[PDB]
From a paper:
The mutant is translated as a stable protein where the J-domain (residues 1 to 69) of DnaJB1 is fused to the cAMP-dependent protein kinase (PKA) catalytic (Cα or C) subunit (PKAc) (residues 15 to 336). In its resting physiological state, PKA exists as an inactive holoenzyme, which is composed of 2 C subunits and 1 R subunit dimer. All 4 R subunit isoforms share a similar domain organization which consists of an N-terminal Dimerization/Docking (D/D) domain followed by an intrinsically disordered linker that connects to 2 tandem cyclic nucleotide binding (CNB) domains. To provide mechanistic insight into the functional consequences of the DnaJB1-PKAc fusion protein that might allow us to better understand how it is a driver of FL-HCC, we used single-particle cryo-electron microscopy (cryo-EM) to determine a structure of the RIIβ holoenzyme formed with J-C. This is the first cryo-EM structure of any PKA holoenzyme and also confirms the differences between the compact RIIβ holoenzyme and the more extended RIIα holoenzyme that was shown by negative staining EM.
We then further masked the core regions and focused on local areas for refinement. After continued classification and refinement, we were able to visualize 1 side of the J-domain and CNB-B domain together with clear density for the B/C/N-helix. The overall structure reveals distinct density for 1 complete RIIβ:J-C protomer, especially the contiguous B/C/N-helix (B-helix, C-helix, and N-helix), the CNB-B domain, and the J-domain (top). In this protomer, the J-domain and CNB-B domain are in close proximity. In contrast, the J-domain and CNB-B domain as well as the A-helix in the J-C subunit remain unresolved in the other protomer (bottom). This asymmetry could be an essential mechanistic feature of the RIIβ holoenzyme. By using cryo-EM 3D reconstruction, we are able to observe this state that could represent an important event in PKA activation. The J-domain presumably can stabilize the CNB-B domains either through spatial steric effects or direct interactions that are driven by the close proximity. This close communication between the J-domain and the CNB-B domain is captured in one of the protomers in our cryo-EM structure. Our MD simulation data clearly indicated that the J-domain can stabilize the CNB-B domains, while the cryo-EM structure revealed how the J-domain and the CNB-B domain interact and together control the A-helix.
Residue numbers in the entry:
A (entry chain A): 1 to 405
B (entry chain C): 104 to 398
C (entry chain B): 96 to 405
D (entry chain D): 104 to 265
Write the structure that this text describes.
């Protein structure tokens, strides 16, 4: 991470000009004879290592090659993303193919159900949406993002969505199957994870956050329901229509109504760092044992959010307490995510004493406890729901408004 | 083990920032008396949204406020229907009834305070309350459409007005298009009257500020510099709505230049190097890149 | 069916209550339907029989009249005098909390009705804030008396509500008066703090709090009743200082309770501290906006031989 | 301000052991192995009802117990009918699916650990939730009628004699 050229300020040819100035600055900053707090020793050691390696290209050649490879990979990823954005896709789906079985869960946006293919025959999930509720609210901008997100997928975490199908008054989107269940149900059943499980969850959260930030794609939506556990022993995210990348600011408030930071409640801008805050309170549910807001009226929730005060029962960890105490001001200006790379202060923190993202990059680490897989159609882990068929008349209702799909 | 709760999707109205055309100043006009305006301002000050708003937006909302006269036994707002209005009980008492599993339980009333449907303006949601008449009265407020429009217009004006005033400075090459928004958001606002010293003499000048509105005459004590002995108005650098000062303070490291003086009502910003040192770090290493200019 | 109905008045586990107009005189009255469905599905004939036997020869100011009672081939309708005004819990929730005189008057009325019930050997049993009616003249009335007993004796009945119990009732232990006193210690709390006494998302927490007697001193509470609340919760009853059999020589000699002129209160003369605002016949501003459910009359005989005592 | 839940009554059969029924000393003991009793006592010696009880009553309750073999996939209890039984967590995974407003949701799976069903013995209450058996097992079917009758009879006899 720490480039040897940027540590002391040198171009391609590290000469004996600014090296002395950098060494003097480093010595004036870090001083073992005067300073003794933790964290400074590692920084001083890294600075000394960079200084001694800058004088010998034999040790900086590997770092230069790694940086060049990282830059080439980033450029290739950006080119692929641009090509996918500039490449449309449609007319690759049909209704007479997948037959529904039962309902899995409906909400204020869509209904996920179980379907089976008529050709091969395999259980899968299908999200159905009705344009009747979207026409009244007018949310075509959020739905248009899915047309491009369907193709913008080049990572394991990114669920490779299937081809969608728009009807006269209904839309269907097939996705992968999740024999396991959701994390919210497991948390409500247990209510208190151990140390290994919490560490694994934090590592997965950091990994998915880094993956989402690499593409500069605002997550926007965030809730416990957006976290499914697959039978392979991993975590997956759902509902990506809310994602969007705009040069300017935005104002579409929709996603975290309860876990809303005090910076957006006043109808103001925000950045991707808020995604951590809205999720930080979630960690409380996996530490204390009860919900964060012990009230029912939105006024009490807003007063508790604006009032910088969080309890600390005799059940939290050592580093988690410090992490929660560091973030308490109203105007979160010293955020740990709003940095250059955004993967230094969080990884170097005491909470992540031992981590290894390379092992998870290739997907080869068995989860602590994988849900029981009782063969295909093992919908016992997921929550049940009443059956509700599609009772809509076959009639066109504004087709031009739903052309791009 | 727990009562539990639903996880329903929430919604808010959208807007097109590219649409800059709007009303001249306000559609509804109804200037009330001074006592009523003062009472409305005092009642609104208790709201959290009115804690950071400036007097300009308050006066705009007061001028654009809409008054509605409700008689006895009148009924307009009802539960279930999509909420599309908002009012405030200026006087009297009106009990509100909310549904509770097929029972319209009461919640309470207000007396020259409160705000019926204050949350409806934060997001689109069905009517979660029921109002009922009691006696002739007047309610002040504004619908959600106009309120959201005015709020978004003010936000866009505050976001776009500030930046164009720094792009002209050739010094600005390191900041990217994404950091400009963060810098504009971090910039605050402060007001200084006549005689109020901005900063005492002999302080460690290691920052940068730009004048927003109001001429600022920088002066110092005639002593070291060869000039008239009798102290007075030194011709250092009169800052105005366009000029700048404080840039030459990271590499030169010259002695105490001078001290500013706010003449009358002067509005200035509130930048700080701490916020800039979080991402790009100290500007000393960033400004060294463009050495061809300073040399 | 010699009564013209107007609009429903209430629906719940206790039953249904509607408003009727006397055809022989023209006056608004309340009509409570026994239904008997839940009674046969839950067995509640003993409570009704006890209430009937009690009301057969019991009359006091803190009781509702029994004017005309009607039994059909499969239903029963009890008529009573209507008291426009509404319950005090609605006003308490609308405002927030009352003052010290209000709590003093409430405690005075509570001890008065307790003494009246003890004079004839009776037990109130159930006690909730949804059983109070305030008229315009200040005459307070109590409703819902099915949860009672003729003679105290020594039984092991289990009823009431989870929000008003004590360890003596969880494992029946007679509780000739603890159920009517211990739980009362929390009632004042409902009319003191700015939030309900019990606030938990699971009945286990409520049971643990009821078993572990400990009142949480609110952030804003008067120091006068603090000492009383710090001792209202107890296991036994003989250790309690203010708990004489007379019940008059203990509350009157208290710290805050001293000027409680019971002579003028028991005679129904002193006006209430909060009189409801009237408007017309059968007001509805104080009551909720509850709607009427599906009503059904009798068809044939199904369980008419139940209350075979009239 | 709040949803304000209802406050329905919790009446039940007024068991007056004095002149009811005709039989007497109807204990109906059902002995079993010693290992099962020893394993069940570990969990029985921690409930609020058994935390303060005479050893004789605890021994009688431990002796009186009926077993029921439940296979995989059997809706023996469903949210709707009245509830009169106390099921003890003996062995096997059992999912508690509650019909939250007509929607099934897992409350807390029990696997030879914990304790539930005691609420049914507090008063007349319908079924708590659906107990789905994921695999075969042997549960304890303790009815409500037996528990109050001896538990009150012993106290009455002790108060009459002692």
């Amino acid at each position: 991470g720490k480039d040897y050229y940027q540590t002391l300020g040198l171009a391609r040819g590290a000469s004996d000009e600014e090296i002395k100035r950098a060494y003097r600055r480093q010595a004036l900053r870090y001083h073992p004879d005067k300073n003794k707090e933790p964290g400074a020793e590692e920084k001083f050691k890294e600075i000394a290592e960079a200084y001694d390696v800058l004088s010998d290209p034999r040790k900086r050649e590997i770092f230069d090659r790694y940086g060049e490879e990282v830059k080439e990979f980033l450029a290739k990823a950006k080119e692929d993303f641009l090509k996918k954005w500039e490449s449309p896709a449609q007319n690759t789906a049909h209704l007479d193919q997948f037959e529904r079985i039962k309902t899995l869960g409906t909400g204020s946006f869509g209904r996920v159900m179980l379907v089976k293919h008529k050709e091969t025959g395999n259980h899968y999930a299908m999200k159905i949406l009705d344009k009747q509720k979207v026409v009244k609210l007018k949310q075509i901008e959020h739905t248009l993002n899915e047309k491009r997100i369907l193709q913008a997928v080049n990572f394991p975490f990114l669920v490779k969505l299937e081809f969608s199908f728009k009807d006269n008054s209904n839309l269907y989107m097939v996705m992968e199957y999740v024999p396991g269940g959701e994390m919210f149900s497991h948390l409500r059943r247990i209510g208190r994870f151990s140390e290994p499980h919490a560490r694994f969850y934090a590592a997965q959260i950091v990994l998915t956050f880094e993956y989402l930030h690499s593409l500069d794609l605002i997550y926007r939506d965030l809730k416990p329901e957006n976290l499914l556990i697959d039978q392979q022993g991993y975590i997956q995210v759902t509902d990506f229509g809310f994602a969007k990348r705009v040069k300017g600011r935005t104002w579409t408030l929709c996603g975290t109504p309860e876990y809303l930071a005090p910076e957006i409640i006043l109808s103001k801008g925000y950045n991707k760092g808020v995604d951590w805050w809205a999720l930080g309170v979630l960690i409380y549910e996996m530490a204390a044992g009860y919900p964060p807001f012990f009230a029912d009226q939105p006024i009490q929730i807003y007063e508790k959010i604006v009032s910088g005060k969080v309890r600390f029962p005799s059940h939290f960890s050592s580093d988690l307490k410090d992490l929660l105490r560091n973030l308490l001001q109203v105007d979160l200006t010293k955020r740990f995510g709003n940095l250059k790379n955004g993967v230094n202060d969080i990884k170097n923190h005491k909470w992540f004493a031992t981590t290894d993202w390379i092992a998870i990059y290739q997907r080869k680490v068995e989860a602590p406890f994988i849900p029981k897989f009782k063969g295909p159609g093992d919908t016992s882990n997921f929550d049940d729901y009443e059956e509700e068929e599609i009772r809509v008349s076959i009639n066109e209702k504004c087709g031009k408004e739903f052309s791009e799909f | 083990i727990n009562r539990f709760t639903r996880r329903a999707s929430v919604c808010a109205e959208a807007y097109n920032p590219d649409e800059e055309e709007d009303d001249a100043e306000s559609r509804i006009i109804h200037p009330k008396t001074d006592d009523q305006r003062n009472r409305l301002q005092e009642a609104c000050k208790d709201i959290l949204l009115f804690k950071n708003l400036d007097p300009e937006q308050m006066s705009q909302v007061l001028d654009a406020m809409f008054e509605k006269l409700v008689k006895e036994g009148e009924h307009v707002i009802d539960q279930g229907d999509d909420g599309d209005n908002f009012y405030v009980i200026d006087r009297g008492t009106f009990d509100i009834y909310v549904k509770c599993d097929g029972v319209g339980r009461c919640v309470g009333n207000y007396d020259n305070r409160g705000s019926f449907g204050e949350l409806a303006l934060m997001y689109n949601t069905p009517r979660a309350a029921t109002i009922t008449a009691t006696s002739p009265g007047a309610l002040w407020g504004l619908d959600r459409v106009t309120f959201r429009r005015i709020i978004v217009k003010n936000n866009a004006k505050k976001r776009k007005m500030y930046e164009s005033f720094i792009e002209s400075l050739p010094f600005l090459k390191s900041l990217e298009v994404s950091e400009r928004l963060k810098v504009v958001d971090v910039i605050g606002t402060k007001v200084y009257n006549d005689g109020e010293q901005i900063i005492a003499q002999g302080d460690s000048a290691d920052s940068f500020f730009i004048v927003e509105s109001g001429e600022v005459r920088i002066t110092m004590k005639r002593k070291g510099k060869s000039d008239i002995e009798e102290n007075g108005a030194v011709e250092i650098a009169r800052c105005l709505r366009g000029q700048y000062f404080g840039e030459l303070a990271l590499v030169t490291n010259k002695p105490r230049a001078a001290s500013a003086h706010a003449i009358g009502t002067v509005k200035c910003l509130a930048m700080d190097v701490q916020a800039f040192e979080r991402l790009l770090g100290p500007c000393m290493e960033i400004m060294k890149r463009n050495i061809a200019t300073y040399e």
